[PDB]
Amino acid sequence: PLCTLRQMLGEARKHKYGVGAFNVNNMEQIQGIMKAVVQLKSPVILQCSRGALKYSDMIYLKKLCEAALEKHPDIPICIHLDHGDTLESVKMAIDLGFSSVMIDASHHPFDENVRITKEVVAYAHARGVSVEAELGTEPQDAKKFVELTGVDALAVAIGTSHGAYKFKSELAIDRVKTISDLTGIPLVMHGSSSVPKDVKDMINKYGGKMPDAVGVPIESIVHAIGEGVCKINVDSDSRMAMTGAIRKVFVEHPEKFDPRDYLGPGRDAITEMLIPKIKAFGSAGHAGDYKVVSLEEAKAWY
């Protein structure tokens, strides 16, 4: 069923493992992800960025998600607005039957970022919906941030960053623990694609051009994980992996044109790449640790 981030991350913090979070933008993706988490009996977070919602004129994406909830009802699935900007986006995501929200004001100075966040929190928790925010990275800063806002989780900064191009060639775990300890809440790692090496070579050898493309290498995420980090945001890898396959299939048989003939594989790679990843995140088997609290019951907490 549809699950709160307080909880799914709750059981993550407690049990020293982390849940992978995936930006979805269409069906073949929601499907790739799902096939993986199900195979490894794993909880899952499905992320829809504000670009994903528009890409899919909102409704298709809500609907695709409800298919997953209903196809795999014993698998804790959380649906999560990624990088919220305003409060009205969140009204939007909440309206969509979403059950977690991120409000990203980390580009404002502390007090502004604090205020935006608090306004989102006030709305969401009123509905039982959880809230993730971002800072920076001073441990106290965190402690203030959280105490002053009451969010269910923190995006911390240890020098990852969005996209395929993170470091010129091929991180602070030391900060993740204190932050974890002095805050008592789960932390979150945005920017945690790996550009796995198979993903990359395949895109590159099949007409594509990203001869650079570093990532966070998994060992760093494993390490981070046990030192508090509970939610791991993964986007690029997914994009990359679908694209390699499509390109592969376009070269190896240019007579095919039914998109199903490359999207179907662009899907199965997503799922393959995902599987070791998830596995090292150490969330497998955990899918059925819990009675999943609904949103109305999630209201009690607050």
Q: Which residues are annotated as a binding site?
A: 49, 83, 162-163, 166, 190-191, 193, 233, 235-236, 239, 260
Interaction residues for Zn ion, span 103-122 (CB under 5 A): none
Q: How many chain residues touch Zn ion (CB under 5 A)?
A: 3
As measured in angstroms, the least distance from the Cβ of 83 to Zn ion is 6
Cα(80)–Cα(130) distance, integer angstroms = 9
Q: Tokens 């039914």 appear where?
A: 258
CA distances from 34 to 43, 52, 91, 134 (A): 10, 17, 26, 27
| Burial of 88 from C-beta contacts in 10 A (0-12 / 13-18 / 19+) | exposed
As measured in angstroms, the least distance from the Cβ of 98 to a copy of itself is 16
Among 160, 193, 243, 283, binds a copy of itself (CB under 8 A): 243
**Which H or E element spans position 262?**
helix 260-281
Residue 134 touching Zn ion (CB under 5 A): yes
Residue 250 touching a copy of itself (CB under 8 A): yes
Residue type, 180: S
Q: Do 38 and 271 touch, CB atoms closer than 8 A? A: no
Q: Do 154 and 146 touch, CB atoms closer than 8 A? A: yes
Site string for Zn ion, 199-228 (x = CB under 5 A): ------------------------------
Which of a copy of itself, Zn ion, none has residue 190 at its interface (CB below 5 to 8 Å by kind)?
Answer: Zn ion
Q: Determine the interface stretch with a copy of itself among 128-136, 176-184, 241-249, 278-286 (rule: CB under 8 A).
A: 241-249
Cα(228)–Cα(70) distance, integer angstroms = 31
Cα(218)–Cα(234) distance, integer angstroms = 12
Structure token pair of residue 87: 């409060």
As measured in angstroms, the least distance from the Cβ of 150 to a copy of itself is 34
Among 3, 8, 64, 114, binds a copy of itself (CB under 8 A): 64
As measured in angstroms, the least distance from the Cβ of 48 to a copy of itself is 12
Structure token pair of residue 41: 């009996």
Among 14, 15, 16, 59, binds a copy of itself (CB under 8 A): 59
Collapsed DSSP state (helix, strand, coil) of residue 195: coil
Cα(189)–Cα(247) distance, integer angstroms = 30
Residue 27 touching a copy of itself (CB under 8 A): yes
Which of a copy of itself, Zn ion, none has residue 207 at its interface (CB below 5 to 8 Å by kind)?
Answer: a copy of itself
Judged by the rule CB under 8 A, the positions of this chain that interact with a copy of itself are 25-31, 51, 55-57, 59-60, 62-64, 66-67, 70-71, 164, 203, 207-210, 236, 239-240, 242-243, 246-247, 250-251, 254-255, 257-260, 263-264, 266
